[PDB]
Design a protein around this ligand. Structure first.
Ligand SMILES: COc1cc(Cc2cnc(N)nc2N)cc(OC)c1OC
Ligand SMILES: [Cl-]
Ligand SMILES: [Cl-]
Ligand SMILES: [Cl-]
Length: 150
């Protein structure tokens, strides 16, 4: 019943948008509809297996392995009856969906290194936190966080 729109993003120092983070992203997107910007799809260069790939863009695309949406309302309709839709970037897409999003999956990475939208922390409360030190596989330390709208 109903639908929850969730943002998922890896944020470095500032709002600027690591195998462990990819596992976390895989953990929280698999078996769910996914909405991404055209540039993000280009960067990934493929469809993500195990989920419905919705690419939101003003113009169509030559890749029919994914579904192309012309507006946010079209993208949400393409999610069907899914309980939760994952909005996975990029920065323009996060801007588009922030007001409609009630959940946020954030990975904070300790790297200096296009900004994530500014949001009032007063409107969001943390419902999960987990810190991980860098190790052999991961060059940096990172913190996983899930925020839900007050
Ligand atoms: C799964 O592969 C990718 C995924 C993403 C999106 C993404 C990746 N990580 C997190 N925490 N949130 C996201 N929205 C971004 C990527 O680079 C554009 C990817 O290629 C490595
Ligand atoms: Cl698949
Ligand atoms: Cl729109
Ligand atoms: Cl902004």
């Amino acid at each position: 019943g109903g639908m929850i729109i969730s943002l998922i993003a890896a944020l470095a120092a500032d709002r600027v948008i690591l195998p462990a983070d990819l596992a976390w992203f895989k953990r929280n997107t698999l078996n769910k509809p996914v909405i991404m910007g055209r540039k993000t799809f280009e960067s990934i260069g493929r469809p993500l297996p195990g989920r419905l790939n919705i690419v939101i863009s003003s113009q169509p695309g030559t890749d029919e392995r994914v579904t192309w949406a012309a507006s946010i309302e079209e993208a949400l309709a393409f999610a069907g009856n899914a309980e939760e839709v994952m909005v996975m970037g990029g920065g323009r897409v996060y801007k588009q969906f922030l007001d409609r999003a009630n959940r946020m999956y954030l990975t904070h990475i300790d790297a200096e290194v296009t900004h994530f939208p500014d949001y009032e922390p007063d409107e969001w409360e943390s419902v999960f936190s987990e810190f991980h030190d860098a190790d052999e596989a991961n060059s940096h330390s990172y913190c996983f966080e899930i925020l839900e709208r007050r």
